[PDB]
Tab-separated table of C-alpha atoms in Angstrom:
chain	number	residue	atom	x	y	z
A	1	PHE	CA	113.358	72.200	70.997
A	2	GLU	CA	110.426	73.120	73.598
A	3	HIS	CA	110.845	72.546	77.336
A	4	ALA	CA	108.169	74.062	79.497
A	5	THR	CA	109.214	74.325	83.024
A	6	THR	CA	108.467	76.662	86.074
A	7	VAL	CA	111.206	78.502	87.729
A	8	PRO	CA	110.691	79.990	91.415
A	9	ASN	CA	111.213	83.861	91.180
A	10	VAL	CA	114.047	84.191	93.490
A	11	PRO	CA	116.909	86.169	92.188
A	12	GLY	CA	120.293	84.428	92.371
A	13	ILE	CA	118.958	80.895	93.163
A	14	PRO	CA	119.801	78.555	89.961
A	15	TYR	CA	117.276	76.360	88.599
A	16	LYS	CA	118.570	73.051	86.638
A	17	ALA	CA	116.743	70.865	84.579
A	18	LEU	CA	117.418	68.086	81.896
A	19	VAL	CA	116.056	68.094	78.703
A	20	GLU	CA	115.789	64.211	77.499
A	21	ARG	CA	114.756	64.151	73.858
A	22	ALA	CA	113.762	60.552	72.722
A	23	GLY	CA	116.691	60.194	70.332
A	24	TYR	CA	119.480	62.539	71.621
A	25	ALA	CA	121.629	62.717	74.646
A	26	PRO	CA	120.456	64.463	77.718
A	27	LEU	CA	121.146	68.086	77.649
A	28	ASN	CA	121.801	70.286	80.795
A	29	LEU	CA	120.103	73.435	81.099
A	30	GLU	CA	120.181	76.123	83.995
A	31	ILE	CA	117.700	78.908	84.316
A	32	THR	CA	118.599	81.709	87.013
A	33	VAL	CA	116.920	84.900	87.433
A	34	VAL	CA	119.537	87.901	87.722
A	35	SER	CA	117.461	90.767	88.253
A	36	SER	CA	113.647	91.577	88.242
A	37	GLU	CA	111.776	94.832	88.204
A	38	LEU	CA	108.028	95.653	88.996
A	39	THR	CA	107.238	99.155	87.485
A	40	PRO	CA	103.754	100.218	87.502
A	41	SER	CA	101.659	102.950	85.498
A	42	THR	CA	101.891	106.504	87.117
A	43	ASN	CA	100.136	109.437	86.259
A	44	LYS	CA	101.077	112.859	88.093
A	45	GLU	CA	98.256	114.612	89.829
A	46	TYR	CA	100.283	117.652	91.090
A	47	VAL	CA	103.231	118.884	93.174
A	48	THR	CA	103.331	120.081	96.613
A	49	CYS	CA	105.821	121.975	99.031
A	50	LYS	CA	105.977	124.612	101.767
A	51	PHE	CA	104.126	127.839	100.611
A	52	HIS	CA	105.336	131.073	100.749
A	53	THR	CA	102.841	133.872	101.889
A	54	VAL	CA	103.153	137.137	99.921
A	55	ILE	CA	101.819	140.333	101.731
A	56	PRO	CA	101.899	143.065	98.955
A	57	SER	CA	102.736	146.713	99.638
A	58	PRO	CA	99.132	147.791	100.860
A	59	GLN	CA	96.760	150.086	99.189
A	60	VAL	CA	95.473	153.122	100.863
A	61	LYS	CA	92.744	155.696	99.525
A	62	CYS	CA	92.873	158.997	101.610
A	63	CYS	CA	89.194	160.446	101.171
A	64	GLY	CA	87.559	157.568	99.101
A	65	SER	CA	86.803	153.875	99.044
A	66	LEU	CA	88.084	150.887	97.801
A	67	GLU	CA	86.562	147.434	96.641
A	68	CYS	CA	88.136	144.146	96.606
A	69	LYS	CA	88.402	142.395	93.193
A	70	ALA	CA	89.008	138.959	91.879
A	71	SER	CA	92.287	137.296	91.119
A	72	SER	CA	93.541	133.921	90.110
A	73	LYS	CA	96.303	133.593	92.579
A	74	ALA	CA	96.426	130.757	94.974
A	75	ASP	CA	94.370	131.405	98.056
A	76	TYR	CA	93.472	135.162	97.375
A	77	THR	CA	92.314	136.932	100.381
A	78	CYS	CA	91.455	140.597	100.118
A	79	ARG	CA	89.517	142.965	102.822
A	80	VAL	CA	88.735	146.678	102.933
A	81	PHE	CA	89.273	148.511	106.278
A	82	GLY	CA	87.802	151.996	106.715
A	83	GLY	CA	88.308	154.567	109.548
A	84	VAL	CA	92.011	154.312	108.731
A	85	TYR	CA	95.107	156.764	109.750
A	86	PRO	CA	98.286	155.088	108.700
A	87	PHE	CA	101.649	156.305	109.496
A	88	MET	CA	105.078	156.109	108.523
A	89	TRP	CA	108.466	157.467	109.435
A	90	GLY	CA	107.766	160.741	107.823
A	91	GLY	CA	104.488	161.001	109.853
A	92	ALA	CA	100.873	160.803	108.573
A	93	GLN	CA	99.874	159.446	105.351
A	94	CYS	CA	96.352	161.199	104.544
A	95	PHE	CA	94.864	164.279	105.013
A	96	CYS	CA	91.518	163.006	106.092
A	97	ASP	CA	91.526	162.114	109.710
A	98	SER	CA	88.789	159.500	109.177
A	99	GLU	CA	87.121	157.790	105.949
A	100	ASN	CA	90.611	156.517	104.688
A	101	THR	CA	90.035	152.901	103.617
A	102	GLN	CA	92.846	150.446	103.466
A	103	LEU	CA	93.010	147.153	101.206
A	104	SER	CA	94.769	144.094	102.417
A	105	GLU	CA	95.876	141.188	100.165
A	106	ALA	CA	97.123	137.903	100.482
A	107	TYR	CA	98.200	134.879	98.440
A	108	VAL	CA	100.807	132.147	98.369
A	109	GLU	CA	103.621	130.922	96.038
A	110	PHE	CA	106.189	128.407	95.868
A	111	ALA	CA	109.147	129.035	98.250
A	112	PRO	CA	112.564	129.971	96.583
A	113	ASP	CA	113.977	126.304	97.703
A	114	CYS	CA	111.007	123.939	96.634
A	115	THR	CA	113.106	123.114	93.369
A	116	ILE	CA	114.661	120.792	95.854
A	117	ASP	CA	112.293	120.167	98.479
A	118	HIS	CA	108.952	119.053	97.284
A	119	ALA	CA	106.574	116.030	96.727
A	120	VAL	CA	105.049	114.528	93.846
A	121	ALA	CA	101.608	112.771	94.069
A	122	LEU	CA	101.089	109.845	91.690
A	123	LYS	CA	98.207	107.156	90.977
A	124	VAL	CA	99.653	104.100	90.110
A	125	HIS	CA	97.947	101.255	87.918
A	126	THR	CA	98.658	97.492	86.804
A	127	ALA	CA	102.259	96.823	87.485
A	128	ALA	CA	104.226	94.572	84.933
A	129	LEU	CA	107.019	92.603	85.881
A	130	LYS	CA	110.344	92.194	83.898
A	131	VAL	CA	113.262	89.929	84.541
A	132	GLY	CA	116.786	89.319	83.367
A	133	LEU	CA	117.571	85.796	82.895
A	134	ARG	CA	120.950	83.737	82.422
A	135	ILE	CA	120.386	80.489	80.728
A	136	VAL	CA	123.075	78.121	79.952
A	137	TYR	CA	122.515	75.052	77.751
A	138	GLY	CA	125.538	72.692	77.154
A	139	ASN	CA	128.615	75.036	76.409
A	140	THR	CA	126.612	78.323	75.528
A	141	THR	CA	125.440	80.968	78.105
A	142	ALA	CA	122.685	83.327	77.140
A	143	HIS	CA	121.630	86.602	78.616
A	144	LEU	CA	118.182	88.087	78.087
A	145	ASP	CA	115.283	90.281	79.144
A	146	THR	CA	111.597	89.189	79.031
A	147	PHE	CA	108.220	90.331	80.191
A	148	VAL	CA	106.431	87.847	82.337
A	149	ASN	CA	103.199	88.138	80.699
A	150	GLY	CA	102.771	84.917	78.572
A	151	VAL	CA	102.594	86.358	75.091
A	152	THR	CA	105.904	88.393	74.518
A	153	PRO	CA	108.774	86.401	72.712
A	154	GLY	CA	111.745	87.387	75.419
A	155	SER	CA	114.582	88.544	73.873
A	156	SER	CA	116.755	85.351	72.377
A	157	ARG	CA	119.605	85.246	70.270
A	158	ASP	CA	119.645	81.848	68.700
A	159	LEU	CA	116.821	80.833	71.175
A	160	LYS	CA	113.068	81.654	71.995
A	161	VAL	CA	111.767	82.137	75.581
A	162	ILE	CA	108.075	83.085	76.607
A	163	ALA	CA	107.482	83.928	80.326
A	164	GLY	CA	104.344	84.188	82.201
A	165	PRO	CA	101.771	84.760	83.641
A	166	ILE	CA	103.210	85.225	87.177
A	167	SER	CA	101.536	82.910	89.457
A	168	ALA	CA	100.780	85.580	91.798
A	169	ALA	CA	99.738	89.299	91.126
A	170	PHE	CA	101.767	91.289	93.644
A	171	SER	CA	102.341	95.117	94.013
A	172	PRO	CA	103.978	96.877	97.055
A	173	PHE	CA	102.255	100.264	95.799
A	174	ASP	CA	98.849	101.345	96.747
A	175	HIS	CA	96.690	103.070	94.581
A	176	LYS	CA	98.391	106.828	95.646
A	177	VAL	CA	101.788	107.062	96.199
A	178	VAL	CA	103.956	110.296	96.936
A	179	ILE	CA	107.665	110.724	96.248
A	180	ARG	CA	109.809	113.245	98.409
A	181	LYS	CA	113.600	113.223	97.358
A	182	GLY	CA	113.847	109.675	96.549
A	183	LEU	CA	111.478	108.257	99.204
A	184	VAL	CA	108.370	106.627	98.247
A	185	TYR	CA	105.414	106.512	100.531
A	186	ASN	CA	101.931	104.978	100.412
A	187	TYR	CA	99.681	107.885	101.031
A	188	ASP	CA	96.270	108.937	100.336
A	189	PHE	CA	96.498	112.320	99.146
A	190	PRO	CA	93.723	114.857	98.234
A	191	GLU	CA	92.435	114.995	94.444
A	192	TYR	CA	93.699	118.046	92.706
A	193	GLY	CA	91.601	120.822	93.553
A	194	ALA	CA	90.746	119.212	96.877
A	195	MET	CA	92.735	121.218	99.132
A	196	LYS	CA	92.028	121.018	102.826
A	197	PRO	CA	94.222	123.679	105.016
A	198	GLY	CA	96.857	122.242	107.359
A	199	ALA	CA	97.199	118.640	105.688
A	200	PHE	CA	99.432	117.507	102.929
A	201	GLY	CA	98.408	118.800	99.329
A	202	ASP	CA	97.397	122.329	100.768
A	203	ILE	CA	98.976	123.787	97.416
A	204	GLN	CA	98.644	122.146	94.187
A	205	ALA	CA	100.110	122.891	90.960
A	206	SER	CA	101.084	120.841	87.686
A	207	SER	CA	104.665	121.915	87.748
A	208	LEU	CA	107.130	124.120	89.931
A	209	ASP	CA	107.016	126.850	87.483
A	210	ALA	CA	103.421	126.529	86.684
A	211	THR	CA	101.635	129.871	86.717
A	212	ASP	CA	98.029	128.504	87.904
A	213	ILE	CA	98.566	127.376	91.460
A	214	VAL	CA	95.361	126.330	93.698
A	215	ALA	CA	95.742	126.741	97.395
A	216	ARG	CA	93.454	126.648	100.525
A	217	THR	CA	95.609	127.727	103.546
A	218	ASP	CA	92.921	129.441	105.691
A	219	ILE	CA	94.109	133.071	105.506
A	220	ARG	CA	91.949	135.358	107.642
A	221	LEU	CA	92.969	139.330	107.341
A	222	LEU	CA	92.612	141.419	110.437
A	223	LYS	CA	91.586	144.879	111.091
A	224	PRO	CA	94.951	146.968	111.830
A	225	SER	CA	95.186	147.901	115.595
A	226	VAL	CA	98.078	149.976	115.574
A	227	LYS	CA	98.891	153.482	113.800
A	228	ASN	CA	101.782	152.471	111.694
A	229	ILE	CA	100.956	150.830	108.467
A	230	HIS	CA	100.393	147.268	109.035
A	231	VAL	CA	98.608	144.172	107.213
A	232	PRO	CA	97.860	141.730	110.253
A	233	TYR	CA	96.721	138.062	109.157
A	234	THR	CA	96.602	134.693	110.576
A	235	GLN	CA	96.936	131.342	108.952
A	236	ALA	CA	97.206	127.761	108.984
A	237	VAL	CA	100.354	125.856	109.491
A	238	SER	CA	101.891	124.153	106.130
A	239	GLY	CA	100.333	120.914	105.636
A	240	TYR	CA	103.661	119.899	103.729
A	241	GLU	CA	105.516	120.475	106.801
A	242	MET	CA	102.844	118.819	109.041
A	243	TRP	CA	103.335	115.556	106.541
A	244	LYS	CA	107.049	116.031	107.002
A	245	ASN	CA	106.812	115.722	110.433
A	246	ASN	CA	104.136	112.709	110.275
A	247	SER	CA	105.464	110.954	107.251
A	248	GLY	CA	105.968	107.570	108.995
A	249	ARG	CA	108.314	104.930	107.567
A	250	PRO	CA	109.229	104.918	103.633
A	251	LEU	CA	108.373	101.951	101.160
A	252	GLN	CA	112.098	101.366	101.301
A	253	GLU	CA	111.634	99.829	104.665
A	254	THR	CA	108.216	98.050	104.614
A	255	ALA	CA	107.949	96.807	100.941
A	256	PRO	CA	107.178	92.869	101.340
A	257	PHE	CA	109.196	89.987	99.652
A	258	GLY	CA	112.407	91.825	100.107
A	259	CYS	CA	111.612	94.313	97.262
A	260	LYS	CA	113.955	97.332	96.620
A	261	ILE	CA	112.356	100.521	96.162
A	262	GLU	CA	113.993	103.035	93.240
A	263	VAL	CA	112.483	105.968	91.708
A	264	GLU	CA	113.188	107.504	88.243
A	265	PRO	CA	111.005	105.294	87.246
A	266	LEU	CA	108.940	104.306	90.214
A	267	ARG	CA	109.885	100.586	90.393
A	268	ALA	CA	110.554	97.434	92.873
A	269	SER	CA	113.678	95.370	92.027
A	270	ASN	CA	114.658	92.031	93.145
A	271	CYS	CA	111.583	91.071	94.666
A	272	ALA	CA	111.490	87.097	95.689
A	273	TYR	CA	107.561	86.153	95.004
A	274	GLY	CA	105.626	83.306	93.283
A	275	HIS	CA	106.768	81.290	90.101
A	276	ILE	CA	107.459	81.921	86.813
A	277	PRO	CA	106.453	79.720	83.931
A	278	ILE	CA	109.320	79.548	81.099
A	279	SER	CA	108.820	77.908	77.597
A	280	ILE	CA	112.266	77.614	75.805
A	281	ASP	CA	112.941	76.545	72.170
A	282	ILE	CA	116.417	74.830	72.064
A	283	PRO	CA	118.329	75.255	69.063
A	284	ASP	CA	119.021	71.691	67.166
A	285	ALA	CA	122.716	72.558	67.132
A	286	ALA	CA	122.864	72.297	70.796
A	287	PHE	CA	121.936	68.408	70.834
A	288	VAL	CA	124.351	65.659	70.308
A	289	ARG	CA	122.961	62.440	69.611
A	290	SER	CA	123.629	59.419	71.855
A	291	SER	CA	125.878	57.708	69.297
A	292	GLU	CA	128.172	60.702	70.130
A	293	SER	CA	127.971	60.939	74.073
A	294	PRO	CA	129.540	58.408	76.382
A	295	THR	CA	127.347	55.535	77.134
A	296	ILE	CA	128.223	54.288	80.834
A	297	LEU	CA	127.292	50.861	81.742
A	298	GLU	CA	127.006	50.871	85.517
A	299	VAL	CA	126.967	53.582	88.338
A	300	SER	CA	126.282	53.485	92.014
A	301	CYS	CA	125.424	56.281	94.655
A	302	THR	CA	127.414	56.532	97.869
A	303	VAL	CA	126.126	59.384	100.046
A	304	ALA	CA	128.782	60.865	102.581
A	305	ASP	CA	127.555	63.079	105.517
A	306	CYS	CA	124.581	65.354	104.845
A	307	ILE	CA	122.592	67.956	106.899
A	308	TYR	CA	119.334	69.573	105.497
A	309	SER	CA	120.739	73.193	105.285
A	310	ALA	CA	120.338	76.164	102.995
A	311	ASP	CA	124.067	75.593	101.765
A	312	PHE	CA	125.425	72.327	99.740
A	313	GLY	CA	125.633	70.547	103.147
A	314	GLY	CA	125.526	67.219	101.717
A	315	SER	CA	127.882	65.051	99.381
A	316	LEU	CA	128.114	61.940	97.217
A	317	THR	CA	130.468	60.097	95.104
A	318	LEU	CA	129.437	58.044	91.989
A	319	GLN	CA	131.217	55.031	90.832
A	320	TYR	CA	130.967	54.429	87.054
A	321	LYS	CA	132.326	52.319	84.272
A	322	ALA	CA	132.178	54.255	80.721
A	323	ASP	CA	133.396	52.768	77.540
A	324	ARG	CA	135.160	55.831	76.491
A	325	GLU	CA	135.952	59.475	77.604
A	326	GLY	CA	133.644	62.327	77.479
A	327	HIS	CA	131.973	65.352	79.220
A	328	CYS	CA	128.467	63.735	80.423
A	329	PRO	CA	126.006	66.117	82.398
A	330	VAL	CA	124.868	65.175	85.999
A	331	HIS	CA	121.212	65.702	87.295
A	332	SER	CA	119.299	65.135	90.757
A	333	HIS	CA	115.828	64.123	89.841
A	334	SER	CA	113.930	65.240	93.081
A	335	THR	CA	112.280	68.705	93.894
A	336	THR	CA	113.869	68.550	97.459
A	337	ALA	CA	117.611	67.860	96.647
A	338	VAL	CA	119.845	70.175	93.965
A	339	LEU	CA	123.070	69.264	92.792
A	340	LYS	CA	125.784	71.815	92.522
A	341	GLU	CA	127.520	70.755	89.322
A	342	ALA	CA	125.887	70.116	86.203
A	343	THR	CA	128.487	68.282	83.977
A	344	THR	CA	131.544	66.430	84.502
A	345	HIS	CA	134.427	64.385	82.729
A	346	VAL	CA	134.142	60.676	82.838
A	347	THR	CA	136.696	58.135	81.881
A	348	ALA	CA	136.726	54.298	81.401
A	349	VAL	CA	136.517	53.636	85.137
A	350	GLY	CA	136.615	56.129	88.141
A	351	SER	CA	134.816	57.979	90.633
A	352	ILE	CA	132.957	61.652	91.045
A	353	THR	CA	132.073	63.346	93.933
A	354	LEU	CA	129.074	65.732	93.808
A	355	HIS	CA	127.640	68.267	96.363
A	356	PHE	CA	124.089	68.712	97.174
A	357	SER	CA	121.541	70.743	98.962
A	358	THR	CA	118.402	69.372	100.351
A	359	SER	CA	115.685	70.056	102.927
A	360	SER	CA	114.603	66.614	103.744
A	361	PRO	CA	115.815	64.381	106.652
A	362	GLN	CA	116.370	61.695	104.290
A	363	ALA	CA	118.415	61.513	101.059
A	364	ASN	CA	116.478	59.189	98.819
A	365	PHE	CA	116.739	60.971	95.467
A	366	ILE	CA	117.783	59.734	92.029
A	367	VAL	CA	120.891	61.105	90.271
A	368	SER	CA	121.853	60.685	86.399
A	369	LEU	CA	125.124	60.299	84.885
A	370	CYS	CA	125.040	60.183	81.067
A	371	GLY	CA	121.647	59.821	81.760
A	372	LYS	CA	121.837	56.661	83.708
A	373	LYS	CA	120.002	56.578	87.055
A	374	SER	CA	121.116	55.639	90.342
A	375	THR	CA	119.574	55.610	94.064
A	376	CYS	CA	120.923	57.486	96.731
A	377	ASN	CA	119.802	56.278	100.308
A	378	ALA	CA	120.953	57.911	103.616
A	379	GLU	CA	119.669	60.122	106.618
A	380	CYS	CA	120.545	63.701	107.013
A	381	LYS	CA	121.296	65.032	110.675
A	382	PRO	CA	119.531	68.340	111.578
A	383	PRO	CA	122.129	71.279	111.029
A	384	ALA	CA	124.070	72.954	113.967
A	385	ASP	CA	124.346	76.442	112.674
A	386	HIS	CA	121.033	78.360	113.344
A	387	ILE	CA	121.578	81.421	111.255
A	388	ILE	CA	123.085	81.763	107.561
A	389	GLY	CA	123.492	84.470	104.852
A	390	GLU	CA	121.949	82.316	102.013
A	391	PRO	CA	118.410	81.453	100.914
A	392	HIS	CA	117.209	78.108	100.915
A	393	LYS	CA	117.796	76.416	97.673
A	394	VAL	CA	114.899	73.980	97.662
A	395	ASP	CA	111.238	74.229	99.108
A	396	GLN	CA	109.937	72.003	102.037
A	397	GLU	CA	107.638	69.423	101.025
A	398	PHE	CA	105.402	67.606	103.711
A	399	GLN	CA	106.179	64.071	102.225
A	400	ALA	CA	109.832	64.784	102.235
A	401	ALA	CA	109.686	66.595	105.568
A	402	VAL	CA	109.010	63.720	107.821
A	403	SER	CA	111.985	61.106	108.363
A	404	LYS	CA	111.448	57.620	107.233
A	405	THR	CA	111.427	56.351	110.929
A	406	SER	CA	108.671	58.526	111.899
A	407	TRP	CA	106.839	57.521	108.668
A	408	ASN	CA	107.600	53.956	110.017
A	409	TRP	CA	106.333	54.501	113.504
A	410	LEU	CA	102.920	56.464	112.330
A	411	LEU	CA	102.369	53.717	109.674
A	412	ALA	CA	102.869	50.817	112.125
A	413	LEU	CA	100.290	52.648	114.657
A	414	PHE	CA	97.895	53.345	111.921
A	415	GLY	CA	98.083	50.035	110.561
A	416	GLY	CA	98.087	48.296	113.849
A	417	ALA	CA	94.775	50.175	114.552
A	418	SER	CA	93.489	49.144	111.090
A	419	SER	CA	94.420	45.655	111.398
A	420	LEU	CA	92.660	45.427	114.498
A	421	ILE	CA	89.220	47.000	113.404
A	422	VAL	CA	89.753	44.422	110.327
A	423	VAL	CA	90.246	41.367	112.485
A	424	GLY	CA	87.011	42.652	114.690
A	425	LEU	CA	85.110	43.075	111.653
A	426	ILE	CA	86.003	39.608	109.885
A	427	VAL	CA	85.292	38.162	113.433
A	428	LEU	CA	82.043	39.589	113.601
A	429	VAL	CA	81.099	38.332	109.914
A	430	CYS	CA	82.639	34.836	110.580
A	431	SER	CA	81.005	34.103	113.969
A	432	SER	CA	77.756	35.428	112.338
A	433	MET	CA	77.678	33.354	109.327
A	434	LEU	CA	78.432	30.527	111.509
A	435	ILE	CA	74.964	30.933	112.938
A	436	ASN	CA	73.558	30.495	109.002
A	437	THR	CA	75.479	27.555	108.560
A	438	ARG	CA	74.997	25.512	111.655
A	439	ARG	CA	71.046	26.361	111.296
B	1	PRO	CA	123.266	118.920	95.498
B	2	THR	CA	126.555	117.816	96.940
B	3	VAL	CA	127.936	115.172	98.961
B	4	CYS	CA	128.587	115.209	102.795
B	5	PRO	CA	130.667	112.985	105.187
B	6	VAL	CA	128.352	111.053	107.430
B	7	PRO	CA	129.256	108.553	110.329
B	8	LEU	CA	129.533	104.703	110.294
B	9	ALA	CA	128.484	103.157	113.465
B	10	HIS	CA	130.153	100.276	115.334
B	11	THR	CA	129.344	97.115	113.784
B	12	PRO	CA	127.103	94.873	116.074
B	13	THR	CA	127.894	91.397	117.283
B	14	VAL	CA	125.284	88.649	116.682
B	15	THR	CA	124.626	85.653	118.823
B	16	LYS	CA	122.050	83.610	116.695
B	17	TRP	CA	119.609	81.458	118.597
B	18	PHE	CA	117.011	79.161	117.209
B	19	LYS	CA	114.859	81.112	114.549
B	20	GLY	CA	115.988	84.435	115.849
B	21	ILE	CA	119.045	86.655	116.532
B	22	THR	CA	120.194	89.209	119.052
B	23	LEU	CA	122.089	92.189	118.144
B	24	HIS	CA	124.500	93.940	120.457
B	25	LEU	CA	124.505	97.760	119.637
B	26	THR	CA	126.724	100.341	120.656
B	27	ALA	CA	125.596	103.959	119.923
B	28	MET	CA	126.878	107.233	121.589
B	29	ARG	CA	124.112	109.302	119.871
B	30	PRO	CA	120.964	108.058	118.517
B	31	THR	CA	121.223	105.962	115.163
B	32	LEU	CA	118.370	104.279	113.285
B	33	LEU	CA	117.962	100.561	113.505
B	34	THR	CA	115.095	99.066	111.026
B	35	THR	CA	114.011	95.402	110.326
B	36	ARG	CA	112.062	93.710	107.924
B	37	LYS	CA	111.209	90.070	106.882
B	38	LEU	CA	111.295	88.862	103.311
B	39	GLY	CA	108.047	86.990	102.952
B	40	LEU	CA	104.418	88.143	102.354
B	41	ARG	CA	104.508	90.000	105.542
B	42	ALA	CA	107.188	92.376	106.483
B	43	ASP	CA	106.663	93.058	110.194
B	44	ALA	CA	108.752	96.328	109.805
B	45	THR	CA	110.411	97.921	112.828
B	46	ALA	CA	112.158	101.213	113.415
B	47	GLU	CA	113.822	102.715	116.382
B	48	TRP	CA	116.639	105.263	117.277
B	49	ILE	CA	118.861	103.652	119.912
B	50	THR	CA	121.310	105.430	122.192
B	51	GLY	CA	123.894	103.507	124.487
B	52	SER	CA	124.893	100.033	124.560
């Protein structure tokens, strides 16, 4: 049936729980996040790359005038120059020694190789998380993908799972991102049409084959100072090149919570952040009544050496007596200690050794076998290894992060102070009311 | 688009002090070392390293 549990959003770290129905044998279930994806909503503003300045073949009118026209070409510049007398290899090109105007043009296009080297400017909106889960209850394992919002019934063959809402809202993307050749950057780019020379986004189009390009590259057309035909001009640097020199570090190296950043579509994968509430409806063919599961009569817990480590640095043995054989489950009923196994075979008499992970200096958790509880008591030493290649399997709680010896010392001192104050107050009241009694 | 062979560096030796590591790096030519933290703050770093 229903089981409401909260699962930490950490990929690869199993979460074990025991569903205890009031009439059936306890059932093990393990919920693990295998993969997570945090994809936002994106909208393309424009594309940008290095521009190509095109200087056409100049126009020359020999004994007349010319005028500048209007064009739709990106950053279209035009200028008329009179008193011109241009030359080529063959010689002079006009028959008037003066009054021989020349027309200069300049505009920009996309370079031939921009089909590979280009950036896409995108705006991002609310990011939605999807996770892949592996759920094993009893003898059956189930794999499914669910949306962590709290409403969508996560895909579930012979099951039903609802995840969400996530306990925190996190996104590695600012409102504006750029993507270049698979690398993602948080960059505040100019709006479409708001181009500035020498900065990123100085040439803008919807597509690379788009026929309408807007640009602002600060083209200046100068009067020709030589006798051969020439269109002198000066211009600003490419803002795309300047940005490629000043891009900084990508988002694949700066994203928090260990997110892996991927494109097509833009997403963050395998982030570790927050907690995920999950509601699962277990099918009733996965429950067996207590009349079929073994019923052990006693169980004791002995703890071997333990350390509070990120790995299974502890061990314990359960000594039991069952009336028959079977396949009972096991479970630790503390938030700071987790077992490695989930089920075991039990016989008439025997022992089972179990391995656990704790964060507490003291191991005072409760362990169940066939649903029967025993108390484990020991103290765990600090680990020797400083660094490992695993994540910690449990969280660190202030109560189970102070040793029992330290708690005893602190309680002894605080209680001694409280008892001194109480003795003082009782002496004050008693030896004052003695005045009332005596007269 | 194609594929090109790129060099693999000498694997470093790690020393593991308390709440920290040190990396012993060997590099004839500049190679890039980046780090980041896996919590709320990344504290990201990046440096091209030549020499040992």
